[PDB]
Amino acid sequence: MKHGIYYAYWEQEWEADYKYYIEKVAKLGFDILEIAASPLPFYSDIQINELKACAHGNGITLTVGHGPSAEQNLSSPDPDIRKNAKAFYTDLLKRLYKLDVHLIGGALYSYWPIDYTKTIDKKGDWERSVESVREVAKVAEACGVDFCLEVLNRFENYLINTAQEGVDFVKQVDHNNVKVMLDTFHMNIEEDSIGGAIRTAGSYLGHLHTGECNRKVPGRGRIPWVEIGEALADIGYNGSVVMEPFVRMGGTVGSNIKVWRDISNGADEKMLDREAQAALDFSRYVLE
Amino acid sequence: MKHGIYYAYWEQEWEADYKYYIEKVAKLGFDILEIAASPLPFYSDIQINELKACAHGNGITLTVGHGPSAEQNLSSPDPDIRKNAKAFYTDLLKRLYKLDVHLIGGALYSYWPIDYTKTIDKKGDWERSVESVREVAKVAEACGVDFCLEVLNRFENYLINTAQEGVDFVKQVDHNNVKVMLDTFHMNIEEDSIGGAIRTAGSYLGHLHTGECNRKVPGRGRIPWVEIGEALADIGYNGSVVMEPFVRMGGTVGSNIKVWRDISNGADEKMLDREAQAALDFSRYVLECH
Amino acid sequence: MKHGIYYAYWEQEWEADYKYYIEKVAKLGFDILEIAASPLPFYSDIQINELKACAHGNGITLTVGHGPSAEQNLSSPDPDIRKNAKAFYTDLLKRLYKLDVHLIGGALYSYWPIDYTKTIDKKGDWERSVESVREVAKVAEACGVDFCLEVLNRFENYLINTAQEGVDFVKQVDHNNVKVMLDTFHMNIEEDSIGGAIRTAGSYLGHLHTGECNRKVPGRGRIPWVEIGEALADIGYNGSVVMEPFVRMGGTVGSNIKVWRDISNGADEKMLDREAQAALDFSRYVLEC
Amino acid sequence: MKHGIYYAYWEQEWEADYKYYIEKVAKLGFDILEIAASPLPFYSDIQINELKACAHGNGITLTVGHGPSAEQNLSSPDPDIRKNAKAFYTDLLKRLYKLDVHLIGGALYSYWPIDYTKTIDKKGDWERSVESVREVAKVAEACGVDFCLEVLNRFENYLINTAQEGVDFVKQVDHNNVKVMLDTFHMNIEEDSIGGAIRTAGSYLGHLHTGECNRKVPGRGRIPWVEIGEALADIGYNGSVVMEPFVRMGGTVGSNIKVWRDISNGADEKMLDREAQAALDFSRYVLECH
Ligand SMILES: O=C(CO)[C@H](O)[C@@H](O)[C@H](O)CO
Ligand SMILES: O=C(CO)[C@H](O)[C@@H](O)[C@H](O)CO
Ligand SMILES: O=C(CO)[C@H](O)[C@@H](O)[C@H](O)CO
Ligand SMILES: O=C(CO)[C@H](O)[C@@H](O)[C@H](O)CO
Ligand SMILES: [Mn+2]
Ligand SMILES: [Mn+2]
Ligand SMILES: [Mn+2]
């Protein structure tokens, strides 16, 4: 089982010097660094090439996360936005291929954060979304990428809030490259059972995000890690597990994540690295 | 210990025929019915008295919940809005006195739902609100009403997200009639420890909301009810416990609570009643004594 | 599911006026009353028939538990003992048949409590037990009785301490009416996973005892009830669930169960009744899907 | 806090080459090695000193555990036995002083394992034990040793089974060098609440043993480690945390601990080393601060 961390645990914006984090994460022992997709369309082939070489040189595998903007919304009623959305993932998936990245995840079937002042048409968005994703999946297949649909809590999405919904949506899409992605932070709000959600995901589970109830590093909170380890084994999960802790206020990230108190308690970079490493030790011990 | 349920469990709007629910609730065995405050300002003294009369007749105690509108936002930098807010509350409080309800709770220090497409000024809203609430605290005291500030999760508010912040804020307000309020649904998100949060609230805890991780009635979910019960015994809690389940899509309630799937699983009113009563027995059994 | 309670929750000896308890549990709403086997061998035909009629007239099903004496030890190396044991069970099972009882459970593959003053021979005891149980099974079968082997903690038995061991032992016996029986109080000690244990027992699970970690009535302690209910659902368990609370000091029961403090907090009979009933309500509410 | 492991994790008899284990746990990274008191009485002053020196050299602190024999029973109604027991501990304590050991724990107020064959007289034994312990306490104070009374499950002792009973006994003894000692294995069986037991022990808590429900190394079982960490922080625990895993069949340890299956599942010495090391990391991580 491969273990990673989202670079944003250290940064307040959806972009960073990924080569720097690739190096940090390697020294700390992770197998994976997960990066945000948004600066990738602004990279020259030269940059893509060197990011790839840097990760390869450091033994790090790269996975991608992405919170789509309203304009990249595959479920939109506006046919133009859906058109632009498809172009965006087509381009992006192509870059992922160049980067030798085989996994992308997040609210890929919608956009994030969601605007609730707006009027919600779930039934509508759900059908348009399923339709758009199947097309994109063609490209994903072609690019050797698993398109992972993350199940999110009610306050961050209205389309898919439980693993059962995720499975229904994926089955309905019905394409090899579209998987379900669960996240302990989100399962904690919506699920009747954590082990049950994993088991429901079953073979469809393609990626796993981890964090405590309030998004701290895995291990000293209330998440039922031992139960998760059991369930993952029950379903023979071989995928990767990426922690995505958010413990700092300020910035696009602090705001989007709604961190309104310093949950890190003044942690400095060295401190942050220490806890992430300890949490990585915990995860390998407990989850496998 | 006194147990109640919020009338919204059965309705999709922030008002309804309370007399109807008082009767249903007395029949299912609850001690309390919690009602939404919004319609109360438009009650004639006659209908206020009939409500109070209904409750007394059915042996039910009434408590009130309230999600403030932006215009009622006591923390708003706009002084006109603060004015409307404080005026609104004193009329409401005075009315509560007439209906002999001694408890109101909710994001009373802010507004709800919150508009997150706006820029957040926590420290600013925080000092304003503290000043605003202390002021309101006086009318609350004269009306014999406990003004409870409910700790909410990050997605529903940004001023008070943990019991520690609720206590800091209530100690700052520094007034006898202002209490911290906890909700198992909100604690499940923000707290390192449920039992620890209750012990942190301690003497200041004046009200408690219950619901499973996903807002189903208490009982078959992951919320740690026994730890809650033991922590309530640790502090010596003397308030009531109101379950606030939300399992239905639709209306302002469904959209305000973000119920995007049929969590009730097709329940008709009679099934909704069965489940509420069973959770009532569960709660009296698991949360008491220790 | 069918829910019961063990009569000993109200008594300090391994026998009592079962009719009194049948009337009691029926009014409290239980489906089952579980009774101790020990006085049955001394029940005359009409006493047996009267107990049966009492159960039937009250909508109550009777189940049976037994802590075997050393003289009833089917795993004994002494062949005479094994012979006496087979004869004791044979007679008992025929009595259960007259009682219209179809389930007996406990450390039926050994004896209880164990004298840990004697040297253990697990392997030898295990093989003799498998043999003896095989032939007793044949008698139970003909009597219409499921023979349930209860998995116990290490301080009360050395042969079968985990659901996995109970499954191994039962597969070896290889008789359809012989089953694995789990108990929340014993799993709490020996199992890595509660739900895991239940899923391990699976189709072989034939009976379930409940109690908190310290044997208080189910619901207000640390036992993972919700996890248990989910796992029972996964294996499709539809059998019986008998709570076995022990909250009082004194007598053979207090001594055998090792209750060395008043866990009941001065509860009187009516107080004990109210608790059981609340626990029944809880069990029915939380354990079913 | 300082973390340790009981040497018996690797041995099947209540004795062993302690020097060897001191060097083993130093390399594995532990702060402490806990050893059985049994062989200490047979130690020349030369032996004592090298052990003391071996510990000091590897930066390992030594703590002592002891399962008293019937002849060492301080609660015994036979005055000759109580006499011999005082003699035994007064000497053991003098030796501990020479080893610079500041802590000893186990069923020091009774004997272990107990013969549940005899007639148990809890009330009598309790009073005898209280008085005897208090006397021994004097010798402990003089030798600068903390006399830790471990609370055990009903199958292994009948005098003290819950932290509440432990605090009562200790408060009755009324002596500064007598502490309550808790063990996650035993609390898991007898306590309503784990965090609650720890808070109940509070300042009387002088030592803590850890292990999963079935005695594997801490970490992948059902013990509520976080709740424990949080409770220890609630009481500002000022002590050591020693893991006491028992995963091997055979010998007096296999028999006394009642290991009737290979819970280690084939582990060789290296494997055990690794698992204990992972458990250590787990423990410092999960149990610290909060
Ligand atoms: O869990 C999520 C946010 O609530 C997402 O996984 C987010 O963090 C990604 O950065 C984009 O979807
Ligand atoms: O918990 C709450 C909303 O998340 C509130 O308690 C809400 O349900 C009331 O209706 C308004 O305070
Ligand atoms: O659980 C058991 C004792 O530990 C048994 O189930 C016992 O209580 C019965 O009375 C005899 O097996
Ligand atoms: O936990 C204990 C008994 O089960 C004791 O701590 C024991 O393991 C020691 O060896 C007795 O000193
Ligand atoms: Mn995520
Ligand atoms: Mn609430
Ligand atoms: Mn309790």
Ligand SMILES: [Mn+2]
């Ligand atoms: Mn109780």
Ligand SMILES: [Mn+2]
């Ligand atoms: Mn049992």
Ligand SMILES: [Mn+2]
């Ligand atoms: Mn111990």
Ligand SMILES: [Mn+2]
């Ligand atoms: Mn913490």
Ligand SMILES: [Mn+2]
């Ligand atoms: Mn922390």
